[PDB]
Amino acid sequence: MFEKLYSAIIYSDEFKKILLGRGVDDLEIASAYIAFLYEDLPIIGKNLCAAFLRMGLDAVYNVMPSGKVYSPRHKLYPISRYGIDGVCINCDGGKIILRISNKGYDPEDLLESKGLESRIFVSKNFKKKSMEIIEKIWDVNKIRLIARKEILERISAGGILHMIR
Amino acid sequence: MFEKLYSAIIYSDEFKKILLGRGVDDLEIASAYIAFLYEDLPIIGKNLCAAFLRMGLDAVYNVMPSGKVYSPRHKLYPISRYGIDGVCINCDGGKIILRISNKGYDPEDLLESKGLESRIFVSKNFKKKSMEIIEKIWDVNKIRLIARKEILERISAGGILHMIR
């Protein structure tokens, strides 16, 4: 049920290590959870995991150098433009601001949330909490190695330089 | 005695497929043969395979968007500059010019060459003849899969973006 969500989190993590040499952030993973709940909500800002959930490996062609994804067809925007009433992941534009708080949602608590709010907070260490949930259920190391090979196959279709461009 | 040369050819083929979505050309492979025979000769032009022979995996940090390598320390130049008396792979500068001829050297014959004409020629399908030799010695697929893992590992250190710069 959460298969599509957890896969997007592992795959986006692997691609970011290839692209920027580090893995996805607490809030980048949070954006995947938001995209999972609200399929037509625009995600603005640190939105890389949400991009993999909505676009799959095709997200690779729309990543900015910042690691933010621009693909309007999937309602993903690196910065806030006029009229996009979306969630701003770690930023102050859009209709809803999403940031980190002591008493913000844990991954499980966020999936049960039944409504959107003008401001949204996720707990600290959201990434660490979310990975532990996935590690229980899957052999994450085997999944990462498959993801790496599949991402590398994608990049090598037309090459690093064409894919960036 | 030829393992480092054949390895450089397979690794550079795999890296070029990641960088530009295609394999190495007949004369890019020939440039490694030349680097192998003449360790101090500057190599100008289509020179990627020579770069891996001389720099190993460090060649990935010095590739131009043309797939030509710039590393003065390793006598590798993408274009001919004043006083660089080197072999020009597929170009007309330097002191020696290397191109394809219907009568040009085969890989075995080139390895047996004992001096340096003002105009060297390699035969057509030099890449095919070279790949056909290497494939009689190793399971090339095992090499490619290792080269991929190690190239990707190198790229992911600082990420694709920092590497091509």
Residue numbers in the entry:
A (entry chain A), B (entry chain B): 1 to 165
Quote the paper.
Genome segregation is a fundamental process that preserves the genetic integrity of all organisms, but the mechanisms driving genome segregation in archaea remain enigmatic. This study delved into the unknown function of SegC (SSO0033), a novel protein thought to be involved in chromosome segregation in archaea. The segC (sso0033) gene encodes a 165-residue hypothetical protein of unknown function. SegC has a tertiary structure folding similar to those of the ThDP-binding fold superfamily, but SegC shares only 5–15% sequence identity with those proteins. Surprisingly, we found that SSO0033 exhibits nucleotide triphosphatase (NTPase) activity and assembles into filaments in the presence of nucleoside triphosphates (NTPs) and DNA.
To this end, we determined the crystal structure of SegC at 2.8 Å resolution. The monomer structure of SegC exhibits a compact spherical shape consisting of eight α-helices and a five-stranded parallel β-sheet. In addition, the electrostatic surface potential on one side of SegC reveals two positively-charged grooves, which might play a key role in the DNA-binding ability of SegC. In the asymmetric unit, SegC forms a tetramer composed of two types of dimers, i.e. AB and AB'. All four monomers exhibit an almost identical conformation, with the root mean square deviation (r.m.s.d.) ranging from 0.20 to 0.25 Å (in Cα). To determine the most likely interaction interface that could represent a major structural element in tetramer formation, we used the PISA server to measure the surface areas of these two dimer interfaces. The buried surfaces within dimer AB and dimer AB' are 713.4 and 497.4 Å2, respectively (Interface-1 and Interface-2 of Figure 2D, respectively). Therefore, Interface-1 of dimer AB most likely plays a major role in the formation of the SegC dimer, and the interaction between the two dimers contributes to the assembly and stabilization of the entire tetramer. The major residues that contribute to Interface-I are Ile160 and Leu161 from the C-terminal α8 helix of SegC. Furthermore, interactions in the SegC AB' dimer interface (Interface-2) are primarily attributable to loop-rich regions, comprising the α4β2, β2β3 and β3β4 loops of both monomers. We also noticed that two SegC tetramers can assemble into an octamer from two adjacent asymmetric units.
